């Protein structure tokens, strides 16, 4: 005696909030009743006014003040004047079709509207009905607001394990969940939660991905056109870190790029591509600087006859942590063993001058030590040394002379290799 109706009801997924044309199908449905009957009736509890019994006004979930108006259509369906609620079909065919459709050209905001409606059969001149709830979703690019923040002050060289390199924060008041994948020529896990990135200048690769604690905040893993996506509750934060063991990172800028899409869960989940956002930020791995080094050219040098030991440049090696540093000139022709005097060629003329530490600036050196088989004159840091025209008076052609130093920190009879090379130009002027 208990034989009951069978509805199928397929809703749309890709609805973009905004303007919708009247007649736009939102759902398609079929009812199937095999017993004795003379028609079908589908109706709602969300109905509008007793005289338009086909029309429905729907209040949104995110905020009940959002409104969409729909109507029960179908070929052969006419309004149920008898009840005042719903639409009726007349046929003894066991199977009939019907559509739900926006009524009136409207502007629909971004929300989800529950459309719970009811279906039953009519006997030959109540029996057993079916009830279904189902959500229409309208989505917009602004549904979830995303922010990807690069971490400040990373240093090159070997980094800490799982070093935090970005922060993804996703917020939303419309959508309940979101999925995220990296975008890279080289992803290394099925879910796109770990990939590799090339530095813009070097081309060297680092391995990045989601932190071990961000991965555990995922509600589920979904397929979307064959690709695995991890899903997360919106209004949460995921951390992008340096995956795997501790990396040795070349000093460079690395671009990480994320694919973020809204997800509407359902025990039948769907992704909302209208809500999708891709964002890219640059992560800077700067090189670590034990020795702050400032080399500054003297200003107002003029071509022609110059003074013996005339000051050309001033170098100041300031270190907050290390006391003694060594120094050498870099050139194709150094004139003494210690590397403290050498010769520099003009860019435009290519004629050279003799530059070097001033005699006064020498013998402020603590010692002279051996590193790499070459000798370095050590000094005390936070002292300032001056570069000068070495030896006799010099007649310098007006040109720009690139001076280049090589400084290393030393004290302890060893030299730590955060040596730096800095190079300024010196201008002579007719």
Numbering used by the authors: 21 to 145, 156 to 297, 299 to 441, 447 to 466
Paper text:
In order to obtain the atomic detail of Saf pilus, we engineered a recombinant ternary complex, SafDAA-dsc, to mimic the pilus tip. The SafD, SafA1, SafA2 and SafA3Nte have assembled into a thread-like shape with 26 Å in diameter and 136 Å in length/height. In ASU, three SafDAA-dsc molecules with an extended ‘I’-like or a curvy ‘L’-like architecture can be observed. Structural comparisons among SafDAA-dsc structures show that: (1) The overall Ig-fold of SafD and SafA subunits is strictly conserved; (2) The relative orientation between SafD and SafA1 is also conserved. In comparison, Pro20 in between SafA1-SafA2 adopts a trans configuration, allowing SafA2 moving freely away from SafA1 as observed in ‘I’- or ‘L’-like architectures. Three SafDAA-dsc molecules form two sets of dimers (i.e. the Type I and Type II dimers) in a parallel head-to-tail configuration. Consistently, the structure-based mutations, which target the dimeric interface and the proline reisdue (Pro20) in LoopG-A, consistently disrupted the self-associating activity of SafDAA-dsc.
Saf pili are often found in clinical isolates of Salmonella enterica. The saf operon is located on Salmonella enterica centisome seven genomic island, which consists of four contiguous genes encoding the major subunit (SafA), periplasmic chaperone (SafB), outer membrane usher (SafC) and minor subunit (SafD). Saf pili are assembled by the chaperone-usher (CU) secretion pathway. In the DSE step of Saf pili assembly, the N-terminal extension (Nte) of an incoming SafA replaces the chaperone G1 strand (in SafB) via a zip-in-zip-out mechanism, giving rise to a remarkable polymer of SafD-(SafA)n (n > 100).
